[PDB]
Amino acid sequence: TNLCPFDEVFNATRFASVYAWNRKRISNCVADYSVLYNFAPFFAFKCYGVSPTKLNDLCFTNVYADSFVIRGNEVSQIAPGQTGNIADYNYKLPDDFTGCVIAWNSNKLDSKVGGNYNYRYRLFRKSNLKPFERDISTEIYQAGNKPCNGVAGVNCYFPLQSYGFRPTYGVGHQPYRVVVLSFELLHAPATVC
Amino acid sequence: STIEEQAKTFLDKFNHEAEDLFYQSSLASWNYNTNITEENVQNMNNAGDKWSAFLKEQSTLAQMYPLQEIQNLTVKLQLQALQQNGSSVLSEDKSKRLNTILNTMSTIYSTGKVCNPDNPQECLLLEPGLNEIMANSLDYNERLWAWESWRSEVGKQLRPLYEEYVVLKNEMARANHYEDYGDYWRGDYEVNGVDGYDYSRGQLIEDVEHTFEEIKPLYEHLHAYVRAKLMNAYPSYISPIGCLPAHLLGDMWGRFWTNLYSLTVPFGQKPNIDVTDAMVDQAWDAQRIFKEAEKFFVSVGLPNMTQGFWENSMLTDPGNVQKAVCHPTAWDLGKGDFRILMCTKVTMDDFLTAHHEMGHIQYDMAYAAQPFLLRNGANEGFHEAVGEIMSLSAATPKHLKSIGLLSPDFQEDNETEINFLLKQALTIVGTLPFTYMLEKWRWMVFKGEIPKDQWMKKWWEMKREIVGVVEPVPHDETYCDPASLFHVSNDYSFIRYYTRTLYQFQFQEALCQAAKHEGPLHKCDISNSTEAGQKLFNMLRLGKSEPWTLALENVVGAKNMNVRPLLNYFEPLFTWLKDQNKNSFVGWSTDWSPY
Ligand SMILES: *[C@@H]1O[C@H](CO)[C@@H](O)[C@H](O)[C@H]1NC(C)=O
Ligand SMILES: *[C@@H]1O[C@H](CO)[C@@H](O)[C@H](O)[C@H]1NC(C)=O
Ligand SMILES: *[C@@H]1O[C@H](CO)[C@@H](O)[C@H](O)[C@H]1NC(C)=O
Ligand SMILES: *[C@@H]1O[C@H](CO)[C@@H](O)[C@H](O)[C@H]1NC(C)=O
Ligand SMILES: *[C@@H]1O[C@H](CO)[C@@H](O)[C@H](O)[C@H]1NC(C)=O
Ligand SMILES: *[C@@H]1O[C@H](CO)[C@@H](O)[C@H](O)[C@H]1NC(C)=O
Ligand SMILES: [Zn+2]
């Protein structure tokens, strides 16, 4: 038996920032979805297009896993047809999503006394993203009629901001690890079952 | 790109940066207050310096927007808050002079050591001893000596400083497009740009005088009753048709009459409701006190304390191992962090104090979703109003009986309600004329209606005309009597205590009517009522994003201050006082003097 590697995307030492989110492809294995319950307390276990029970009797061509870390206030923005600062400039889901979004609190790992400025998110993108777009470009944002010459000042801002997670904030402003699983059943034989 | 979009982008960036920076300063201040050491002082100073520098540099960029081309009220309010220059439009040497004057007045008031002629080394300072010798004393000569000595020592050292203070602040206000510094203070109650809720800076004076005109008769009756009782207390010293001497009011300044309860009690045989013995007999602690107040807010329909509130707050005295400030305080560190710093004892007063502080905390939690600059009360007198209305309903005998602190074999008597009402009126209604007269005097001084050669004379004749208090002995124009107070020598406004007092009873009557109360207003209880809680939350959630007139209409249904609920609250005491004042003279004559 060859099981899919769900122990590498769910249990990892460090995750990635929201603006640069990590995508992994899973194929040619046997998926044991009940293993996802090994953690147990999940802040969100939403599923769209599939039954609340994972229905281990399904076969797909491949699976995609996307991992990042957000606040607890912005978890509700990871959903089809949602607007905000994360769903417009950082990570967007299509209106016809078929997959599951899992989110759990990770305050004891991603928060430090004095601040944890290693997690960043994008602001002032100048345009809404299309579904599943990354945009890891880092250029000065110009809000005005005077062009910026590559340096910040007055109406010229650096697009990426930091989170600065600390203990003793409150569930609204605490770190949350989010993994999104998408199933792509499009032609070819099915290799994930 | 219109200028409004640039303003919005700037406001977003400023909000994120300020929310990041202010938390560190708040946490450093909390660490210093909880744990007093030397490193904590340095950390707090560094955090404060960083926050001040950031705020200055953001304001400097903030003036870049005209503010005349903004059609959104929220952006306009945030930019108006950010664009104020403050004490920086004037020159640098003048700023240094102003800071030095403020510091020297503050330290002169803080030290203020006073010696005695009995012994060269028997000096008594202000906070210990002098307050005791003026509050719990009964001798005439001793308190007369203290009242003369402290005020003569302090006031004959601050007058040249106070004149330069006044002229410098007037110059700064004039440079900030204000008529005078009194107008700068009054500008907090100003609402403009919204039709139907427009308020002018000059309407405050007229409204305050209109309210005081209706207030006056009850104060006259209470003053006559206190005069009769104190004349019985002091033989051959108080004329029945004159004014009460200043030094016989139980305080250095006469701000509160709460220390006159011992001399003026209707029925001294009956004691008031004290619960401390019942609390001790049931083995209560600080934890139980702060758990029985959370249930009060839950039963009304408001959220309960967060999980970190119990872990991070200090609700007990740390002891002698480390030194902490014992003043109760509700801390809003931001980013969802709410705490309370208090040294709780097993007494009845700490119950009400805990209710007050948790009311403050709930008010803070109500508007946590507002922008950074709009996270405050609508004006300066809503935090305290909410705290006092919360602490007012938890002291009624019905509430004490419900929680079992009062035995079920207990019935209220007509001789106890009057005594409680008089005890509360000696504190609440006895301070309004003092605040009104002090603020009116400072407004007149700032405007210039009082020439510099008429300060003390005008002060001591307004005291006789409005408050009904006559000075013990004449004071020359080399004295600065108002500077003896804490709020005068430290540049603090002294009008919030009037509007807050009115708002207390307005809110209480509104919540009483919402809860279908049947008896008198002084026995109302908002516990177990959800409509009153919802109506209060409707206003608490607004924060500072809407005019205070609109919020007052949301709660009460009126757009201005009203004194009728206070009179409804004090009506039984008023009727009893009128009944007992059949053989006495109401009023006073200013021409009478004790010298
Ligand atoms: C840690 O890894 C194990 C597998 O070795 C897994 O069962 C568990 O759920 C992981 N813990 C997480 C994802 O929090
Ligand atoms: C108070 O500060 C001192 C100074 O470093 C420290 O040793 C002590 O542990 C602190 N106490 C608490 C309760 O944090
Ligand atoms: C003002 O801007 C905020 C967002 O910044 C928006 O929600 C609000 O609707 C605007 N005001 C008006 C009157 O549209
Ligand atoms: C603040 O001071 C600057 C400095 O001259 C001035 O340009 C600006 O108009 C002032 N703003 C206000 C509101 O007084
Ligand atoms: C405190 O709030 C929680 C959070 O919803 C809720 O269970 C209830 O209102 C309160 N809990 C208890 C144990 O009183
Ligand atoms: C409020 O409700 C509680 C529980 O329903 C009840 O025990 C109490 O007697 C009621 N009244 C007061 C004044 O607390
Ligand atoms: Zn308070």
Exposure string for A15-39, b = 16+ CB within 10 A, e = fewer: bebbbebeeeebeebebeeeebeee
Return d(Cα B215, Cα B34) in angstroms, integer. Answer: 43
Return d(Cα B361, Cα B333) in angstroms, integer. Answer: 11
Tokens 């279908």 correspond to B516
Q: Which residues of A touch B20 (CB under 8 A)?
A: 162, 164
Tokens 């930019």 correspond to B79
Token pair recorded at residue A141: 């944002």
Question: HEC string of B41-80?
Answer: HHHHHHHHHHHHHHHHHHHHHHCCCCCCCCCCHHHHHHHH
- DSSP secondary structure of B367-435: TTTS-GGG-S-SSTTSHHHHHHHHHHHTSSHHHHHHTTSS-SS----HHHHHHHHHHHHTTTTTSHHHH
Token pair recorded at residue A118: 């290693």
Ligand 7 center to B488 CA (angstroms) = 20
Return d(Cα B504, Cα B512) in angstroms, integer. Answer: 12
User: Residue B564, SS3?
Assistant: helix
Asked if residues A118 and B7 have their Cβ atoms less than 8 Å apart, the reply is: no
Query: Cα separations (Å) of A83 from A80, A182, B132, B229?
Result: 9, 20, 64, 70
For residue A10, the ligand closest to its alpha carbon is 1
The catalytic residue among B294, B357, B388, B471 is B357
Return d(Cα A183, Cα A97) in angstroms, integer. Answer: 9
Return d(Cα A18, Cα A121) in angstroms, integer. Answer: 6
Q: Which residues of B touch A162 (CB under 8 A)?
A: 20
Asked if residues A103 and A43 have their Cβ atoms less than 8 Å apart, the reply is: yes
CB of A39 within 6 A of ligand 1: the answer is yes
- Candidates A154, A135, A134; CA nearest to B9 is A154
For B332, phi and psi rounded to 5 degrees? Answer: -115, 85
Q: Which residues of B touch A (CB under 8 A)?
A: 1, 5-6, 9-10, 12-13, 16, 20, 23, 61, 64, 306-308, 311-312, 335-337
Exposure string for A148-180, b = 16+ CB within 10 A, e = fewer: beeeeeebbbebbbebbbbebbbbebbbbbbbb
| Residue B364: CB atoms within 10 Å | 20
For B244, phi and psi rounded to 5 degrees? Answer: -70, 130
Q: How was this structure determined?
A: cryo-EM
Token pair recorded at residue B200: 């002018």
Asked if residues B514 and B524 have their Cβ atoms less than 8 Å apart, the reply is: no
Strands A120-122, A160-162: pairing kind: antiparallel
- Candidates B132, B127, B154, B152; CA nearest to B143 is B132
User: Residue B492, SS3?
Assistant: coil
Q: Which residues of A touch B311 (CB under 8 A)?
A: 168
Query: Cα separations (Å) of B321 from B35, B37, B317, B324, B344?
Result: 10, 12, 10, 10, 17
Return d(Cα A41, Cα A102) in angstroms, integer. Answer: 11
- Candidates B564, B431, B555, B569; CA nearest to B497 is B431
- DSSP secondary structure of B262-285: TTS-S-SSSPP---HHHHHHTT--
Return d(Cα B77, Cα B544) in angstroms, integer. Answer: 9
- Candidates B231, B237, B234, B229; CA nearest to B262 is B229
Interchain contact, A169 vs B306, CB within 8 Å: no
Token pair recorded at residue B537: 């939350």
Tokens 């996802």 correspond to A36
- Candidates B535, B559, B557, B536; CA nearest to B548 is B559
Cα torsion A104, A107, A109, A110: sign = positive
The DSSP output letter for B454 is G
Return d(Cα B170, Cα B161) in angstroms, integer. Answer: 14
Which pairs with CB-CB distance under 8 Å and at least 24 residues apart come from B230-236? Answer: B230/B260, B230/B263, B230/B264, B233/B263, B234/B140
Token pair recorded at residue B297: 């807010």
CA atoms within 13 A on the CB side of A101: 20
CB of B554 within 6 A of ligand 3: the answer is no
Contacts of residue B358, Cβ cutoff 8 Å, sequence gap at least 6: B290, B293, B294, B297, B305, B330, B340, B390
Tokens 């310096």 correspond to B49
User: Cα torsion at A103, A108, A114, A116 (round to 10°)?
Assistant: -40
**Cβ-nearest to A168 among B13, B20, B312:** B312
Q: Which residues of A touch B (CB under 8 A)?
A: 123-124, 143-145, 154-155, 157, 161-162, 164, 166, 168-173
Resolution, expressed in angstroms to one decimal: 2.9
User: Between B496-514 and B432-447, two packed helices, what is the crossing angle to 10 degrees?
Assistant: 140
- Candidates B336, B384, B389; CA nearest to B500 is B384
Contacts of residue B274, Cβ cutoff 8 Å, sequence gap at least 6: B348
Strand (E) or helix (H) holding B92:
helix B92-111
Residue type for position B515: A
Tokens 């307005």 correspond to B506
Query: Cα separations (Å) of A46 from B163, B271, B589?
Result: 69, 63, 80
Exposure string for B545-570, b = 16+ CB within 10 A, e = fewer: bbbbbbbbbebbeeeebbbebbbbbb
Exposure string for B145-169, b = 16+ CB within 10 A, e = fewer: bbbebbbbebbebbbebbeebbebb
Return d(Cα B6, Cα A192) in angstroms, integer. Answer: 50
Return d(Cα A174, Cα A71) in angstroms, integer. Answer: 6
- Candidates B73, B75, B70; CA nearest to B11 is B75
| Residue B139: CB atoms within 10 Å | 9
Residue type for position A132: F
Bridge partners, A122 (sequence order): A160
- Candidates B171, B81, B584, B88; CA nearest to B372 is B81
| Residue B97: CB atoms within 10 Å | 15
Domain ranges of chain B: 3-84, 276-377
Instruction: Give nearest CA residue, ligand 4 atom 5.
Output: B89
- Candidates A119, A120, A92; CA nearest to A182 is A92
Return d(Cα B166, Cα A98) in angstroms, integer. Answer: 71
For residue B397, the ligand closest to its alpha carbon is 6
Bridge partners, A65 (sequence order): A24, A181
Asked if residues B27 and B333 have their Cβ atoms less than 8 Å apart, the reply is: yes
| Residue B113: CB atoms within 10 Å | 9
Strands B244-245, B469-470: pairing kind: parallel
Cα torsion B10, B13, B17, B22: sign = positive
Tokens 């001893």 correspond to B129
Q: How many residues does chain A have?
A: 193
User: Cα torsion at B356, B362, B363, B369 (round to 10°)?
Assistant: 160
Contacts of residue A12, Cβ cutoff 8 Å, sequence gap at least 6: A67
Tokens 């601040």 correspond to A115
Ligand 3 center to B206 CA (angstroms) = 35
How far is A140 from chain B, CA to nearest CA, in Å?
14
Residues less than 5 Å from ion ligand 7, measured at CB = B 387
Asked if residues B413 and B270 have their Cβ atoms less than 8 Å apart, the reply is: yes
- Candidates B220, B223, B217, B235; CA nearest to B264 is B223
Contacts of residue A174, Cβ cutoff 8 Å, sequence gap at least 6: A71, A72, A105, A107, A111, A165
Token pair recorded at residue B286: 């600080």
Tokens 């600390």 correspond to A166
Asked if residues B391 and B352 have their Cβ atoms less than 8 Å apart, the reply is: yes
Domain ranges of chain A: 22-131+160-184
How far is A147 from chain B, CA to nearest CA, in Å?
12
Return d(Cα B116, Cα B123) in angstroms, integer. Answer: 6
Asked if residues B181 and B172 have their Cβ atoms less than 8 Å apart, the reply is: yes
Instruction: Give nearest CA residue, ligand 1 atom 5.
Output: A7
Question: HEC string of chain A?
Answer: CCECCCCCCCCCCCCCCCCCCEEEEECCEECCHHHHHHCCCCCEEEEECCCCCCCCCCCECEEEEEEEEECCCCHHHCCCCCCCCCCCCCCCCCCCCCEEEEEEECHHHHCCCCCCCCCEEECCCCCCCCCCCCCCCCCCEECCCCCCCCCCCCCEECCEEECCCCCCCCHHHCCEEEEEEEEECCCCCCCEC
Bridge partners, B337 (sequence order): B334
- Candidates B81, B15, B71, B54; CA nearest to B545 is B81
The reply to whether B30 sits in an annotated binding site is no
Asked if residues B443 and B450 have their Cβ atoms less than 8 Å apart, the reply is: no
CA atoms within 13 A on the CB side of A170: 19
Asked if residues A143 and B6 have their Cβ atoms less than 8 Å apart, the reply is: yes
**Cβ-nearest to B5 among A143, A161, A168:** A143
Tokens 């979805």 correspond to A33
- Residue B247 annotated in active site: no
User: Residue B490, SS3?
Assistant: coil
Q: Which ligand 6 atom minimizes the distance to the CA of B525?
A: 13
Q: Find the closest chain A residue to B61 by CA distance.
A: A154
Asked if residues B591 and B462 have their Cβ atoms less than 8 Å apart, the reply is: no
Q: Is B58 left (phi over 0), alpha (psi -120 to 50) or beta?
A: alpha
Q: Which residues of A touch B23 (CB under 8 A)?
A: 166
Asked if residues B373 and B415 have their Cβ atoms less than 8 Å apart, the reply is: no
Strand (E) or helix (H) holding B329:
strand B329-334
- Residue B487 annotated in active site: yes
The DSSP output letter for B338 is E
- Candidates A156, A153, A179; CA nearest to A16 is A179
Contacts of residue B469, Cβ cutoff 8 Å, sequence gap at least 6: B243, B244, B245, B246, B249, B254, B463
**Cβ-nearest to A169 among B9, B13, B335:** B335
Interchain contact, A157 vs B9, CB within 8 Å: yes
Ligand 7 center to B385 CA (angstroms) = 8
Q: Which residues of B touch A164 (CB under 8 A)?
A: 20
- Candidates B285, B409, B430; CA nearest to B350 is B285
- Candidates B185, B176, B179; CA nearest to B89 is B176
Return d(Cα B286, Cα B354) in angstroms, integer. Answer: 10
Question: A22-131+160-184: what CATH class?
Answer: alpha beta
**Cβ-nearest to A168 among B10, B16, B308:** B308
The reply to whether B38 sits in an annotated binding site is no
Bridge partners, B124 (sequence order): B114
Contacts of residue B350, Cβ cutoff 8 Å, sequence gap at least 6: B289, B342, B344
